[PDB]
Design a protein around this ligand. Sequence first.
Ligand SMILES: CC(C)(COP(=O)(O)OP(=O)(O)OC[C@H]1O[C@@H](n2cnc3c(N)ncnc32)[C@H](O)[C@@H]1OP(=O)(O)O)[C@H](O)C(=O)NCCC(=O)NCCS
Ligand SMILES: CC(C)(COP(=O)(O)OP(=O)(O)OC[C@H]1O[C@@H](n2cnc3c(N)ncnc32)[C@H](O)[C@@H]1OP(=O)(O)O)[C@H](O)C(=O)NCCC(=O)NCCS
Ligand SMILES: NC(=[NH2+])NCCC[C@H](N)C(=O)O
Ligand SMILES: NC(=[NH2+])NCCC[C@H](N)C(=O)O
Ligand SMILES: NC(=[NH2+])NCCC[C@H](N)C(=O)O
Lengths: 280, 128, 424, 424
Amino acid sequence: DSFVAHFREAAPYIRQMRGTTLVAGIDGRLLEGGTLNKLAADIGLLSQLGIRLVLIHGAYHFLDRLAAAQGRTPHYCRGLRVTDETSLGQAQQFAGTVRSRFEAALCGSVSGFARAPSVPLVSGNFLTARPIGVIDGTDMEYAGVIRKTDTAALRFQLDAGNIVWMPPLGHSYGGKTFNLDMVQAAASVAVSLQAEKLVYLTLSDGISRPDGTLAETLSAQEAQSLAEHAASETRRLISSAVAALEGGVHRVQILNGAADGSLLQELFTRNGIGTSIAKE
Amino acid sequence: DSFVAHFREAAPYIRQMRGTTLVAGIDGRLLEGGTLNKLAADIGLLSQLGIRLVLIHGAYHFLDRLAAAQGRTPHYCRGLRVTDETSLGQAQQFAGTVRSRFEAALCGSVSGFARAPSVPLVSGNFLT
Amino acid sequence: DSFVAHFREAAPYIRQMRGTTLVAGIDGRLLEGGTLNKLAADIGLLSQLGIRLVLIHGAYHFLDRLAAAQGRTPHYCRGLRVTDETSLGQAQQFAGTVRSRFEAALCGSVSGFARAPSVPLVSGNFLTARPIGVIDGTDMEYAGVIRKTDTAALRFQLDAGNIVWMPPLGHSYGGKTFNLDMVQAAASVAVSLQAEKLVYLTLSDGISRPDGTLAETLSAQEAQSLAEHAASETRRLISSAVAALEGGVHRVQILNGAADGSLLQELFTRNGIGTSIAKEAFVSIRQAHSGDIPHIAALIRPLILLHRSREYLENHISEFSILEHDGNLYGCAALKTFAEADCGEIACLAVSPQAQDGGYGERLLAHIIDKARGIGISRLFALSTNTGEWFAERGFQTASEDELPETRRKDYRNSHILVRRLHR
Amino acid sequence: DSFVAHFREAAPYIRQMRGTTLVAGIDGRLLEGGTLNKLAADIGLLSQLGIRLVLIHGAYHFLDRLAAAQGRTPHYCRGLRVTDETSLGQAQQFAGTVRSRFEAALCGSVSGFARAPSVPLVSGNFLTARPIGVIDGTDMEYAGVIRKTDTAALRFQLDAGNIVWMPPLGHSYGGKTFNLDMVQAAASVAVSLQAEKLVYLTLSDGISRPDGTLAETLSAQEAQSLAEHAASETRRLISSAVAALEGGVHRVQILNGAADGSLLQELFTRNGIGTSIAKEAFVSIRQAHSGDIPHIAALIRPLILLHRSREYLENHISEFSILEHDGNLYGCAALKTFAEADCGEIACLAVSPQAQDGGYGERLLAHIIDKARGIGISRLFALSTNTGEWFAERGFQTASEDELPETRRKDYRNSHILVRRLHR
Ligand SMILES: CC(C)(COP(=O)(O)OP(=O)(O)OC[C@H]1O[C@@H](n2cnc3c(N)ncnc32)[C@H](O)[C@@H]1OP(=O)(O)O)[C@H](O)C(=O)NCCC(=O)NCCS
Ligand SMILES: CC(C)(COP(=O)(O)OP(=O)(O)OC[C@H]1O[C@@H](n2cnc3c(N)ncnc32)[C@H](O)[C@@H]1OP(=O)(O)O)[C@H](O)C(=O)NCCC(=O)NCCS
Ligand SMILES: NC(=[NH2+])NCCC[C@H](N)C(=O)O
Ligand SMILES: NC(=[NH2+])NCCC[C@H](N)C(=O)O
Ligand SMILES: NC(=[NH2+])NCCC[C@H](N)C(=O)O
């Protein structure tokens, strides 16, 4: 269509998004190739439209490849990862590497043809975690869950215009580090700060129905139906999205982070691409 | 010496440090042992006394000890270390590990016997 | 001790005191000699550590000496001074003189060797007073009591960093001045602004017991006991301290203002010098929360302890109890339970060397046997590799592994196994 | 009178008005001649004394003349104007012209001899209106009523020191303009922002009584009485004033905007010119508090009075009553009581010379005999050295000391002792 027709459709969403909080749970796999640079440039723009952004990457696939590649097969126990000392150790390393990689991409990306101000990015000690403990007799070791979240520190960073970067790691009162599950920690953080949007950036178009068709919009009730017999990965997502919706998050959106402009199509058009989920 | 003699000498400097900026460059070897804990604890204390703290850690020893262990020999020119792809890779990794290690010590430590607020730490794309 | 050890003890109190409000009722007699200069320098420092300070001097002794010296013997009527026009008149004069004297001392004092900013001091019309009237037929004349206090003006001065100076005088809506009683007006002001501390600077070490020993800490209940038969001066103090505590003041402290550094020893050490008074007993035992884990960890490090990778401390924090004295966490203990309902285990009993040999362990043991009895459990176990003698001296007999609960016997495969039978 | 006497009367009102909000409904007719310039200069001054001002002009007379002059006779339907497209059209034009005219007058007016800053004036889209619809079968066309008012925008303009100018027009969600009725929209706006004053500037002195006399003060109840049979114009006013009072506006004042200085006489003197209206009767009698002591003292000074050292005024304030008119404390009286339960004494009856010979004393006497009867007491005494004739004319007979209560007889050892017997 014409430029005007598209702008008439985008502009209201710009009015609405500005000042809004959006929590992005980003798949670890997206933070490397040509995609990283694409994500960073688009995430940059959102920041520049005044959306308050909290970013959280995942790491299970990288930890899973890395383990296999060195002899130890990874154990999941009713769905959550067992994380031993070595893995924890590599998890800290991975967060370091992905953090750097993202700052660089952010620094070297462009928004258009004119010169923009640079984009401020921040991390800190916002999440205090605790060990899950033992499940079905199995020790979950350094697998952890959010205990306490420094919501006031987050709001403070966000009110100042900063993008907040969180790794799937937390510290404990007992002085140790724990591996968090990103899909869940993003849901939990979003509930904590009453975020208007929780966005999962995945390698998939969103939630497909048993017949292949991309869902598109789901109520929580319909989402739980879909989850009955579906892949534990799509099951985890939905379990977490519904919990977010239950806690007050307005919308949870699931997209393909490897598809060019996905984020901009989802947030600024009425149909979006991907799957939108709401309480009712 | 007595408490009051010690408090008397210390108190002026508290008055002076509050609102002061202190940039600390910390040897990377310092962020592992019981020294970590002992350190994190005191940085923790400084922070509660209103000092403004900017911590910057080193890596050269880590990277050189990581080289020896794997056959490579570190090359320095005019004090500064030559840094290959692989080394840069190892540094981003090391940073991850030490930033976590330090956060955990901080969270797990104590100023005194009374319950106190937790100490906020922040990082960011400050350096181009 | 070393500098470091002293600083480790003072620093937390500096974190805590800053932003805090402290009301000082200062004895008139302290505002003259070498002591004045000492007080002023120390009060200066406190101001410089960001403590919010409201100062109020007394005057009865000066008014009492001055009257005697000119023929009129002073009348107290059930404890409070009768203040006639002449005395009132001299009271206004005295406040003037003591005010000047204090500014000068403040101005000319030093805090250390380096150059500090000067210390701002302020007074104003904060107290509106009213006449007590007549008691037992006697006219109290210009003796007065606080009617209304400009709390918002005070907070305003204090938020700006000013020391506030109040004389024991107030004005009335009827356009006259009244003599206040300092001990009481300080209590009243402190209640008004919900001050964390009310400090009485006296010519005495604090409240002594009938046997001479300095008290040290008192609950309000114990303080009122002491007051039954004691000097009307120590009686007035306690009557006012208890009222402050009743109104919300956290602590009321009584010291010797003529003893060098008193104020600094009281406020920045755990023991203090002098007498500390609180609404309830110092020492309480409460249920632990995630927030206490680091204190419990630090209370355990000095050992005799598993606790490296993840924890039982994390997920079972709720079954720990901690002992605190005056806000300091000095001990902890846990009660572990079993598939067997009549069993339990006391675990992690620890009191820091700092507070040790003072009865706290035993208070923790008493507390957890009560918790255990409260839920059935008739046999309480302790397994320990070194602390056996303590429990053995305290009702625990040695037991054999064959007496352990299933899971515990499994674990124990290794030191002294002791039990004590409890009364349901 | 002297300059000082006038300034003593104006100054308090300046303290009070500043920060206050005042909504002025101005008659359209006032916005043209020599009067416009007068209004603008006075309105300027008010602005400069920090009064928050919201101005709203009327237009019915101009719309009514304009219609007649071009053949169409104006229809009112149960009191409100029918406004057709043409009229609406002219109404927009009129608001434009009156707006300009007012800015010019404001710009070119002066406040005194020295040079003042200019006076900021602002309008915007604060009122969203809706059509009244149909009444008694008649279509009211573009006649409208306030639907929604942007109170936050108004407060914002006002906090910044701006005079706000509103025309009697509003827009609708349906995208059309409507004619508002000024008298009503001013009442509605005033209720919306909880204004302390709603002022109607008219071509009349205020509300006259059926006999010609200017009213002056009215309670709402009395105002509604007056409205029963009066001109629909004075009826509209009162209907709107009462609604404002009902919604929280403190006072509604009605004056002559064409009388020089009217506004300044109304707002800064105790009597005003014009008509003041309040929710409840002006004049109330309430129980005294410590806060009134200075007013009572000042009410007593002019005498006949003990009251030097300390007071009975201080500690027995609770037994005083004060009479106020429109917020002014003009009188007081006390009831003193006795070991004898059937006795009492009226003491300190005082009404300031300023408000005297206006019935207040007697209202205070009536009030305290009711208090006294409410507690038994069948004999009320007054002892007075000069005011005997007043009480003697008002049911008090002379009594002998032998009738006094014990304590009172003791005290009296000396002027006229009078009593009045009361009905239990
Ligand atoms: C056991 C302990 C916690 C009790 O603490 P406490 O606060 O001193 O308790 P109390 O003051 O009630 O008891 C003091 C008495 O116990 C004595 N005591 C200390 N350790 C003892 C031991 N191992 N065996 C016997 N008695 C001991 C003290 O010398 C003191 O003796 P006294 O009263 O004749 O002067 C003790 O303080 C301690 O030393 N704890 C060390 C760490 C620990 O206990 N770890 C694990 C325990 S399961
Ligand atoms: C007595 C007093 C308080 C009553 O006040 P008030 O508000 O005028 O009361 P009212 O208006 O109901 O009474 C007005 C009438 O009282 C009259 N009056 C005033 N003082 C009087 C007196 N000493 N003797 C007789 N009548 C007197 C006024 O002239 C007026 O007469 P009028 O109604 O025929 O015109 C009076 O106002 C007064 O002058 N008070 C002076 C101070 C005082 O009273 N001190 C102590 C009293 S115990
Ligand atoms: N998959 C969808 N149906 N998306 C609708 C998105 C609507 C809107 N632009 C938003 O970001 O919330
Ligand atoms: N006399 C005492 N026991 N004093 C204890 C003082 C403890 C603490 N430093 C305070 O100022 O409150
Ligand atoms: N008409 C009257 N009675 N006016 C009294 C006005 C009193 C006061 N100055 C005011 O503006 O409210």
